[PDB]
With several copies, the nearest count.
Chain A
Amino acid sequence: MNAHLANEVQYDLGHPSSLVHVIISSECLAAAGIPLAALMRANFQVEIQTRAHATGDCT
């Protein structure tokens, strides 16, 4: 729950755009190619960028 709280503070203070809160499943992570036990070892920094349509330039 805390991971959705601590993100809207970043969006309230402006860092025009939108924000969509997403729960990934465990099996979506498994087929994506990550080990699930590595994440078990409570916030966690994840770098996120957005890419454009047929342009190449990105945030």
Chain B
Amino acid sequence: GSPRHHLTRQVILTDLCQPNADRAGTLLLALRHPADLPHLAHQRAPPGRQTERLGEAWGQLMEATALRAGLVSFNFLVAACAASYDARDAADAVRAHVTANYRGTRVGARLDRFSECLRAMVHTHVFPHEVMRFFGGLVSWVTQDELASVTAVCAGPQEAAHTGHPGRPRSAVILPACAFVDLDAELGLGGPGAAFLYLVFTYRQRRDQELCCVYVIKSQLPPRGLEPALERLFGRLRITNTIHGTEDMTPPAPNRNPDFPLAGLAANPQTPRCSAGQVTNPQFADRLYRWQPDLRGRPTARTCTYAAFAELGMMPEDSPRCLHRTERFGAVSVPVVILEGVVWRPGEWRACA
């Protein structure tokens, strides 16, 4: 029996993703059209942050790749955020073949620039989980000058799509070992069961000290019950965002709001009232109680986000099988987590505010 899946083709500029260096079987993340970025920053930003930062940080990237809703490969995205992982011995190995295998001049000037774009995304508050969209995993490619024809599986099992070379037709999901974080071993779930795969971003909101991390988490938990497991890992980021994410918002000093008196006003029958026609008349509305609530500089929910997840797929096995090998990407040996038999299902993002 042959299972059913779905292919996509798209003509893609090869500035940010390289289907030649990244071999068949890596993740791909698509963007919005970058004319939308400098205006959403102008509109969704909290008061007192530089809206003129996202339009300048992206402008320094297009002027760095010349020496259009494109595509960012996963191995490019991990090495851009490589200064924020725990296993720094392998995080500087993923960067080691990004600068050395990607076609171009000074690829190492893109990573320090694209990460400056992602730091401008968190700061100008257009979060890239509203911009990075899932696109399928690589099965084949057709090369050309300055662009390529990318074939991918937007939905289905990875191991069903034919590669094209009859010497080695299949492709397994290839991931670097820096992003792949289990929750079976670290929590103690050793029992068999089908496992879900999740894409997870993490932020950290400070003044010019902001981060990015991209993870692929394998778990036996539903998407309805991931938020207690993300909080246990990333609760350090949750605390640092509620007190330091609210900065240059001007607070009311000292407080102006009194306590809310409706429990005391409604108990006393001597308090003055109004009818349905008497209200919204100034002769009768001034006799009531005056109440001027002040919500300014409060740490709102969107200014306290620490992570964001989405569905990515599952492994319908009883015992899902991972591997830890060191594949050679050209001349650089890289710690690689190899996933076996991934059935792709995209889903919508979900902030962990």
Contact = CB atoms under 8 A, between A and B. Distances in A.
Interface residues of A, number: 6
A2 to B, nearest CB: 13
| Range for the number of chain B residues in contact with chain A | under 10
Q: Which of A9, A12, A13, A15 counts the most chain B CB atoms within 10 A?
A: A13
Interface stretch (B110-118, B251-259, B340-348): B251-259
B244 interface: no
Nearest to A9: B250
B296 interface: yes
Interface in B232-265: 250-254
A33 interface: no
Contacts of A9: 250
Q: Which of B250, B252, B254, B296 counts the most chain A CB atoms within 10 A?
A: B250
Interface of B: 250-254, 296-297
A56 interface: no
Interface in A6-43: 9-10, 12-15
Contacts of A14: 252-254
Interface of A: 9-10, 12-15
Contacts of A13: 250-253, 296-297
Contacts of B297: 13
A44 to B, nearest CB: 13
B46 to A, nearest CB: 14
Given A9-B250, A13-B296, 10 more contacts: A10-B250, A12-B252, A13-B250, A13-B252, A13-B253, A13-B297, A14-B253, A14-B254, A15-B250, A15-B253
Contacts of B250: 9-10, 13, 15
5 contacts: A9-B250, A10-B250, A13-B250, A13-B252, A13-B296
Contacts of A10: 250
B132 to A, nearest CB: 32
A16 to B, nearest CB: 13
A11 to B, nearest CB: 10
Please name the 9 residue pairs, one residue from A and one from B, whose CB atoms are nearest each other, closest first: A14-B253, A13-B250, A13-B252, A10-B250, A13-B296, A13-B253, A13-B251, A9-B250, A15-B250
Nearest to B297: A13
Nearest to A10: B250
A46 to B, nearest CB: 16
A47 to B, nearest CB: 15
Contacts of B253: 13-15
